[PDB]
């Protein structure tokens, strides 16, 4: 019934997206910005990974999760680099399978990054709320959560690649992803919002518990540092994802909305999220900065 034999031109014409026939000024601008952001992401995350693997001190679950996040950010940078040199005029020569792969790469990379953030939050909550003195973990749960993260990311990336595509639901197709369906966009946005809510709740509970159990001995304030760290961690995610996340909602709910205007800058910001992640989770640790040299 549905059209697997058609070309990308038909899918892009059914929507309002346009195909560029040459390198426009905006095309070169976004290409340069993306190349710079990609090289920065790769360099920073490779440095983080090598620093974590080299030193013997960084052999604990939190550092393992940080290294997994760094690897996910490196993968996101590679995916965004591949996206570049395949956008603009190059996208006019892409086929269905290649387009699906190019988008699934970004999808799974960003999903893995978000899941790593959530896992870091959960591990911090566990480590803080373990009223028991040490109760050292067997160190096997970290690998379990890592493999679960990667499996969930691979699933979220491959589902739209095989089966959950608007190829056979042509009328119910998006505008920024003419091949994908709006249902997948809604699902991804709900997942992102739920992860953010869970992170905020966990960090707020941590802050409240710490304040309650430290006020007695209060009288380098711990409250100020903890609040600053939580606020930064949450505000990065907010400023990076909210403007891009609301765009999918505008596309699915508001027809005639000029969603195609700021999609590229919003994706650049979502990638800047991973570019800035290694700094947020690695600047406070003085030993981490000391190991750098």
76 binds, among another protein, ligand NKP, none (CB under 5 to 8 A by kind): none
Does 270 bind ligand NKP (CB under 6 A)? Our answer is yes
Does 182 bind ligand NKP (CB under 6 A)? Our answer is no
Does 130 bind another protein (CB under 8 A)? Our answer is yes
- Of the candidate spans 28-36, 102-110, 111-119, 133-141, the one that interacts with another protein by CB under 8 A turns out to be 133-141
User: Where does the chain have alpha helices with state H?
Assistant: 8-14, 25-54, 61-83, 96-129, 141-158, 182-218, 222-253, 263-280, 286-291
Structure tokens belonging to residue 236? 């990065």
133 binds, among ligand NKP, another protein, none (CB under 5 to 8 A by kind): another protein
Does 200 bind another protein (CB under 8 A)? Our answer is no
226 binds, among another protein, ligand NKP, none (CB under 5 to 8 A by kind): another protein
Q: Which is nearer to ligand NKP, 92 or 284 (CB)?
A: 92
Number of residues that bind ligand NKP (CB under 6 A): 17
Binding mask 43-62 for another protein (x = CB under 8 A): -------------x---x-x
Q: Which is nearer to ligand NKP, 61 or 88 (CB)?
A: 88
46 to 90, 243, 263, 277: CA distances (angstroms)? 29, 28, 28, 13
Sign of the torsion angle spanned by Cα atoms 272, 278, 282, 288: negative
| 215 CB neighbour count, 10 Å cutoff | 10
Among 34, 88, 104, 278, binds ligand NKP (CB under 6 A): 88
Place of tokens 């953010």: 196
Among 225, 231, 250, 253, binds another protein (CB under 8 A): 225
Annotated binding residues for a 1-acyl-sn-glycero-3-phosphate: 17, 102-107, 188
144 binds, among ligand NKP, another protein, none (CB under 5 to 8 A by kind): none
Cα distance between the two ends of the chain: 60
Residues in contact with 185: Cβ distance below 8 Å, sequence separation at least 6, in sequence order: 174, 177, 248, 251, 252
Q: Is 15 exposed, middle or buried (0-12, 13-18, 19+ CB in 10 A)?
A: middle
CA distance 224 to 228: 6
- Of the candidate spans 1-9, 104-112, 129-137, 139-147, the one that interacts with another protein by CB under 8 A turns out to be 129-137
Place of tokens 């870091």: 120
Binding site for ligand NKP (CB under 6 A): 87-88, 91, 106-107, 110, 176-177, 185, 188, 244, 247, 263-264, 266-267, 270
């Amino acid at each position: 019934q549905c059209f697997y034999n058609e070309s990308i031109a038909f899918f892009y014409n059914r929507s309002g997206k346009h195909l560029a026939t040459e390198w426009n000024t905006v095309s070169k601008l976004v290409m340069g910005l993306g190349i710079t952001v990609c090289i920065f992401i790769m360099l920073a995350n490779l440095l983080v990974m090598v620093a974590i693997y080299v030193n013997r001190r960084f052999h604990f679950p939190i550092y393992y999760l940080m290294a997994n996040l760094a690897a996910a950010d490196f993968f996101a940078g590679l995916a965004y680099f591949y996206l570049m040199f395949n956008t603009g005029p190059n996208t006019r020569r892409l086929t269905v399978s290649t387009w699906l792969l190019r988008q699934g790469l970004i999808d799974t990379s960003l999903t893995a990054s978000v899941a790593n953030l959530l896992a870091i939050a959960i591990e911090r909550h566990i480590t803080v709320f373990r009223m028991q003195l040490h109760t050292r973990m067997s160190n096997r749960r970290v690998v379990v959560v890592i493999v679960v993260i990667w499996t969930m990311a691979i699933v979220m990336g491959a589902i739209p690649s095989v089966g959950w595509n608007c190829i056979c639901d042509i009328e119910n197709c998006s505008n920024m992803a003419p091949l994908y369906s709006d249902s997948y966009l809604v699902f991804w946005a709900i997942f992102n919002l739920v992860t953010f809510v869970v992170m905020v709740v966990l960090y707020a509970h941590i802050f409240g518990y710490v304040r309650q159990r430290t006020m007695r001995m209060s009288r380098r304030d711990t409250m100020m540092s903890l609040l600053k760290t939580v606020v930064i961690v949450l505000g990065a995610f907010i400023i990076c994802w909210t403007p891009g996340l609301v765009l999918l909602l505008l596309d699915v709910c508001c027809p005639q909305c000029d969603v195609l205007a700021y999609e590229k800058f919003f994706l650049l910001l979502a990638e800047f999220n991973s570019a800035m992640n290694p700094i947020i989770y690695s600047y406070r640790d003085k030993e981490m900065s000391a190991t750098f040299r």
